[PDB]
Amino acid sequence: HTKSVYDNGETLDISLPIHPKSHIPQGKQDRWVVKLPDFLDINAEPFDPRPFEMNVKTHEDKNQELLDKLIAVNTVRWRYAKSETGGIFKETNSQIIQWEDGTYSLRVGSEIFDMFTTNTDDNYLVSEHNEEGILMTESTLSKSVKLVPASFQSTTHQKLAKALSAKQKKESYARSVVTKEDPEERQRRLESQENERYRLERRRKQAE
Amino acid sequence: GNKVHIGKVPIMLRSKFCSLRTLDEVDLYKMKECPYDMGGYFVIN
Amino acid sequence: LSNDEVNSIVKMKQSLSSNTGFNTVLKKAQLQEELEEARDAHDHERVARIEAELKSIGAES
Amino acid sequence: WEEPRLILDQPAQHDNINKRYEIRFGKIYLSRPTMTEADGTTHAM
Fold this sequence. Notes:
The structure is cut from a larger assembly and holds one copy of chain A, two copies of chain B and one copy of chain C.
Chain A: E1 30-34, E2 42-46, H1 49-54, H2 62-74, E3 76-82, E4 88-92, E5 94-98, E6 104-108, E7 111-119, E8 124-129, E9 134-149, H3 155-167, E10 175-176, H4 185-207
Parallel strand pairs in A: 1-9, 2-3
Antiparallel strand pairs in A: 3-4, 5-6, 6-7, 7-9, 8-9
Helix pairs in contact in A: 2-3
Chain B: H1 26-30
Chain C: H1 3-16, H2 21-40, H3 46-57
Helix pairs in contact in C: 2-3
Subcellular location (chain D): Nucleus
Subunit structure (chain D): Component of the RNA polymerase II (Pol II) complex consisting of 12 subunits.
Protein name (chain D): DNA-directed RNA polymerase subunit beta
């Protein structure tokens, strides 16, 4: 019997402000934690075509430019779609597809990335309240999900392979130069000048 | 602060920094170098 | 003769030197070294001139 | 670049003046092999 250490009974009358939720999970407060790959990005901001076109960057490094192009075209985005009835709706370019085997896949455009799920126990999601210095739980993270390219022939995989293969090809640090005179000339001339000023300084100090 | 000279590194023959990497076949004879020589060694003293 | 006088005479004859196989090979090697130096400096303008000069000097038999 | 910094510091009181003298190592420049004669002239080797 490990007796309870705390028996003072002191209690805090702290009241927390909570906001209504736009959605509510049904049947289970379960969520899946998914690691974000390098070739996939999330753009929570609404898609603004004009700033996007005006902010496209061009670099000399072909590998970096190709990687940026791949991540930009593969980035998950969303934008406001004007309905034919005059209303406004949230429109996204990303979907989740479940196959007949029960596996799940993340889809952006025509690209499909498979999901590998590993069950994790005693893993939960919490909401941080920094102003009060306490953590409020949200739900349970039952499964950890990894995103994997569907096949070799997928354009994303081929672009990644090209970028990584040509990235390690460029390696040349030392820069060549042409020597026109003796590399030791500076040292000897500066030593001569230093000895001259040594003699002058010694004479001055003996005369001082 | 600029290019200060720190030393001289011996150069392996027929390597990328050797003078014989270029020069083709004809000039290799004018320099009194055997075209059958394969390099891969240093010349110290 | 002194060393300096020998150098002066050699430079004078080099100015008079129309062509010599040893000297042509040395000039081509120096041009190749200058070309690699320009390449490492990403100077796309000098390298074209050096390539043109190398093409003109070359084509041996 | 394994050891890219040599640092000397000195808290001069001789008026607390903490002076740090640091030298950094930059690029490596290589050249084709060259011969420097006794007279002073240098030429490709």
